[model samples]
Target: PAEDTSGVIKMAVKFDRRAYPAQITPKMCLLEWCRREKLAQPVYETVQRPLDRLFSSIVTVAEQKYQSTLWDKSKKLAAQAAAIVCLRSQGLPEGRLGE
Candidate 1:
């Protein structure tokens, strides 16, 4: 790995997947970064309800908002997906992985 702040969050994402592929999810990785950097914990909000079926999540981190652009089937997944967006928006390697 390299010593740099840019894309550190991106590296964290990949490191988590490689280190704990079976034991972790995007949300966990996102939270860890927030804790380490002393950023506000992410706050999730519903953005939409499509015909009372799928859901959307908009995650707020340190007052900046990052919305999930994809449709999530459940609230749990939606929140996790939204976290990914926040991570990506910061400097993640795959900033547009799910988008």
Candidate 2:
């Protein structure tokens, strides 16, 4: 028997960098530290801190460059974040799925 499982699923994920007090860097500092001290696995996990910082920086630069309205700025930021997520997801390893 064949069953069809084709449908659109809605998902809502909130990424808030402020939730974590520690600073974040794209260089994988925490991951490096963990490996250096033999505290955890060598693989690095993406933290919201770096993403949030990048999001904010992009928004600021765009707003200043275009002198955009509030609504326009919001839309731009959302689009930018979405694109970044897509690119990041494409580079992730298979085992990292659902993380």
Candidate 3:
């Protein structure tokens, strides 16, 4: 024990740090954020189911606002035209059905 005359050497960490859960959030990784945003842009309406359904209501309202007669000759054509126009207003101008 003669070599240990200076007593026990010990370590105290130089820094004390961590994100408090309420104080901070783990950042989304760069590529992950990019992938999410890129995926989200078009899919936003689809995943937001109510948003898409809301657009359905918007179509009938649009038919009234824009006028069904101006849209087309028959109710069927007017409905389709209203939907297409409503979709364009929402963002998808070409408006793919499954998209």
Predictions in order: lDDT? 0.62, 0.28, 0.26
Which residue runs does candidate 1 get wrong by more than 4 Å? Answer: 1-20, 50-52, 93-99
Q: Lowest-lDDT window of 10 residues in candidate 1? A: 7-16
Candidate 2 residue-wise lDDT at 32:
47
lDDT of 2 by residue, 1-99 (tens): 114323311122223334333553222332343356564422212223343443221211111111111111233343333323322333422112233
TM-score of 3: 0.27
**Model 1 lDDT tens row, 1-99:** 223433212111122244335567777778787888888787777766778788777677766666665676777777767777777666653323343
Error of 1 at 63 (Å): 0.8
Residue 98 lDDT (model 1):
46
Candidate of highest lDDT: 1
Candidate 2: regions farther than 4 A off? 1-73, 92-99
Listed in order, each prediction's TM-score against the native is: 0.67, 0.22, 0.27
Tell me the alpha-carbon RMSD of every candidate.
Answer: 8.4, 14.9, 28.9
Q: Model 2 compared with the native: what TM-score?
A: 0.22
10 residues in a row with least lDDT, candidate 2: 60-69
Q: What TM-score number comes out for model 1? A: 0.67
For model 3, state the Cα shift of residue 20 in Å: 53
Query: How many angstroms is residue 10 displaced in model 2 relative to the true structure, after the best TM-score fit?
Result: 10
